[PDB]
Scaffold this motif. Sequence first.
Motif, mmCIF file in Angstrom:
data_model
loop_
_atom_site.group_PDB
_atom_site.id
_atom_site.type_symbol
_atom_site.label_atom_id
_atom_site.label_comp_id
_atom_site.label_asym_id
_atom_site.label_seq_id
_atom_site.Cartn_x
_atom_site.Cartn_y
_atom_site.Cartn_z
ATOM 1 N N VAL A 189 30.524 -76.200 40.611
ATOM 2 C CA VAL A 189 29.996 -74.898 40.895
ATOM 3 C C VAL A 189 30.156 -73.961 39.705
ATOM 4 N N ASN A 190 29.096 -73.243 39.365
ATOM 5 C CA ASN A 190 29.207 -72.155 38.401
ATOM 6 C C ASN A 190 28.918 -70.846 39.087
ATOM 7 N N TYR A 191 29.932 -70.019 39.146
ATOM 8 C CA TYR A 191 29.905 -68.878 40.016
ATOM 9 C C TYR A 191 29.977 -67.608 39.174
ATOM 10 N N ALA A 192 29.055 -66.683 39.449
ATOM 11 C CA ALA A 192 28.950 -65.436 38.680
ATOM 12 C C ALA A 192 29.027 -64.238 39.587
ATOM 13 N N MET A 193 29.647 -63.183 39.087
ATOM 14 C CA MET A 193 29.658 -61.934 39.829
ATOM 15 C C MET A 193 29.334 -60.769 38.931
ATOM 16 N N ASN A 194 28.500 -59.855 39.403
ATOM 17 C CA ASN A 194 28.295 -58.632 38.600
ATOM 18 C C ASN A 194 29.356 -57.573 38.875
ATOM 19 N N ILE A 195 29.471 -56.639 37.934
ATOM 20 C CA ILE A 195 30.281 -55.438 38.081
ATOM 21 C C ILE A 195 29.331 -54.274 37.803
ATOM 22 N N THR B 84 35.847 -40.604 29.833
ATOM 23 C CA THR B 84 34.718 -41.538 29.703
ATOM 24 C C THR B 84 34.414 -42.307 30.983
ATOM 25 N N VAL B 85 33.149 -42.286 31.410
ATOM 26 C CA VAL B 85 32.662 -43.151 32.503
ATOM 27 C C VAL B 85 33.080 -44.608 32.333
ATOM 28 N N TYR B 86 33.227 -45.054 31.086
ATOM 29 C CA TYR B 86 33.697 -46.432 30.830
ATOM 30 C C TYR B 86 35.197 -46.662 31.047
ATOM 31 N N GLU B 87 36.014 -45.640 30.768
ATOM 32 C CA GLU B 87 37.453 -45.720 30.971
ATOM 33 C C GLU B 87 37.713 -45.868 32.450
ATOM 34 N N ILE B 88 36.996 -45.066 33.246
ATOM 35 C CA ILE B 88 37.104 -45.043 34.704
ATOM 36 C C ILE B 88 36.741 -46.393 35.303
ATOM 37 N N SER B 89 35.528 -46.856 35.001
ATOM 38 C CA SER B 89 35.080 -48.128 35.521
ATOM 39 C C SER B 89 35.855 -49.316 34.957
ATOM 40 N N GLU B 90 36.403 -49.178 33.759
ATOM 41 C CA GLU B 90 37.329 -50.171 33.214
ATOM 42 C C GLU B 90 38.631 -50.216 33.982
ATOM 43 N N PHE B 91 39.110 -49.044 34.359
ATOM 44 C CA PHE B 91 40.347 -48.953 35.125
ATOM 45 C C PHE B 91 40.176 -49.535 36.516
ATOM 46 N N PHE B 92 39.082 -49.233 37.209
ATOM 47 C CA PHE B 92 38.891 -49.775 38.553
ATOM 48 C C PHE B 92 38.316 -51.201 38.542
ATOM 49 N N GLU C 116 39.818 -53.539 36.376
ATOM 50 C CA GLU C 116 41.082 -54.293 36.337
ATOM 51 C C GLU C 116 41.786 -54.280 37.685
ATOM 52 N N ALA C 117 41.711 -53.168 38.396
ATOM 53 C CA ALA C 117 42.423 -53.064 39.664
ATOM 54 C C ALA C 117 41.765 -53.916 40.723
ATOM 55 N N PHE C 118 40.435 -53.945 40.727
ATOM 56 C CA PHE C 118 39.729 -54.812 41.656
ATOM 57 C C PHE C 118 40.202 -56.249 41.455
ATOM 58 N N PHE C 119 40.168 -56.735 40.227
ATOM 59 C CA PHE C 119 40.523 -58.135 39.961
ATOM 60 C C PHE C 119 42.015 -58.374 40.171
ATOM 61 N N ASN C 120 42.798 -57.305 40.045
ATOM 62 C CA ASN C 120 44.219 -57.345 40.386
ATOM 63 C C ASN C 120 44.435 -57.522 41.883
ATOM 64 N N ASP C 121 43.655 -56.786 42.681
ATOM 65 C CA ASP C 121 43.646 -56.953 44.148
ATOM 66 C C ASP C 121 43.151 -58.342 44.509
ATOM 67 N N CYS C 122 42.107 -58.794 43.834
ATOM 68 C CA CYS C 122 41.666 -60.181 43.981
ATOM 69 C C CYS C 122 42.788 -61.217 43.827
ATOM 70 N N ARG C 123 43.561 -61.145 42.738
ATOM 71 C CA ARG C 123 44.690 -62.073 42.501
ATOM 72 C C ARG C 123 45.736 -61.993 43.611
ATOM 73 N N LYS C 124 45.928 -60.790 44.140
ATOM 74 C CA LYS C 124 46.862 -60.602 45.227
ATOM 75 C C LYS C 124 46.350 -61.275 46.466
ATOM 76 N N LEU C 125 45.026 -61.351 46.642
ATOM 77 C CA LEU C 125 44.423 -62.015 47.818
ATOM 78 C C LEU C 125 43.973 -63.472 47.573
ATOM 79 N N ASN C 126 44.401 -64.027 46.433
ATOM 80 C CA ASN C 126 44.055 -65.364 45.985
ATOM 81 C C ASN C 126 42.568 -65.591 46.018
#
Length: 418
Positions: free
Chosen positions: A60-66, A74-82, A84-94
């Motif tokens: 399987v090759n699996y892709a996700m957009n952000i 910066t709009v980029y600092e904000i979306s960069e910060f959230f 990392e946190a999304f993928f951090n929550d992801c790791r917490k939920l395996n």
Amino acid sequence: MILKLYNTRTKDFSELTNFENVKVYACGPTVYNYAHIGNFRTYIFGDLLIKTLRFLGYKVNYAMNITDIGHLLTVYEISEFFTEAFFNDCRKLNIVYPDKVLVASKHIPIMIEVVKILEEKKITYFSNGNVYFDTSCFKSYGEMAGFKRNKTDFVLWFTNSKMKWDSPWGFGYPSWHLECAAMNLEYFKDALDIHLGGVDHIGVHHINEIAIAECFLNKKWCDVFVHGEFLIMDFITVKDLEDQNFSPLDFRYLCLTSHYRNQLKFSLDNLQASKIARENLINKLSYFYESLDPVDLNTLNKDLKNFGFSVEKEYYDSFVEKISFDLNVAQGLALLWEIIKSDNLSFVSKLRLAFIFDEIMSLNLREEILKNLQNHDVVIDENMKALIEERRIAKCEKNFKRADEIRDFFAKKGFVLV
Ligand SMILES: Nc1ncnc2c1ncn2[C@@H]1O[C@H](COP(=O)(O)O)[C@@H](O)[C@H]1O
Ligand SMILES: [Zn+2]
């Protein structure tokens, strides 16, 4: 075994016969705030699915957009910060990390190149500052669901007089529909296999992607679309859930006991039942694991799906049958509990199946068993007093291999030897 899934495009189950290279796209999050547990029900769904294909032997090759654009410092600092946190929550939920993460702001060329093409096919038009897709230039539109020229026309590109990009239509930004569609087309080309999202994408966003892509390609795009049902509350983040003394994997467990095409009625009371059920699972498996001898224990380090008894294979196949019919992991879990409580299986067999089912369940059972046991008390019974002699002898005969094998048996039960 072939995965059968419920396809929204056709309102029946599609069979997935192409084991060599299946491409999967999942619409990812908005990154302007923390995601809430509703979002993660859907991401646990994508997870269960990729994990099931892989478990069944598909590559399987699996892709996700952000989507890091500008919802509708910066709009980029904000979306960069959230991001990392999304993928951090992801790791917490395996939740398995995608194979490719497609970031909208990094793929403007393809998006522009898809609009150019659609315009040259006379499908588009410009109104009120925006480039629209004309849905009447497309008889099929929305069959999956049921200032403009038509109610259901949609923006492709937004322009304005004063995050912005130059274009053949002027400075602006793409619509979310064009991001998902264009990025698929660049990364997977003309060839998506499964496209995921939540049911709310059925009636606007997904049909919009399809329109874009099939008009671009001038052919069929993406045969299978799978949608997960809503999580209903009376919204909560993972922190909130940690702060009320829950563990992320409690929400995971809760997501597991319910098919993806059911609504999940969330509550503290049902999350609590999930926490207890997950706690008992670990305690029961810990008793099984504590009780093992070296030969049984070495067996679980090894090749798990090399079965020692027909009765294991039976339960394995009964498992495969369950998940392979439409991601029924909830019946998988049910089956594990039948296995745990069963009297036609040894302790070692129960653990093998636990550890195999966990490749899907992802509850950290192995490592949760080690943590649970590291907290009981030391009781040196005879069978332990004797491995130590066997060891004290082996360390005297200078057979350090045997000595280390004993050492490494105690360590796997959470004992250290000094
Ligand atoms: N209450 C909910 N239950 C399940 N999935 C949801 C819920 N709310 C949003 N989603 C999904 O989460 C993903 C991203 O959500 P959003 O970032 O709010 O657009 C999409 O696939 C949505 O369909
Ligand atoms: Zn999308």
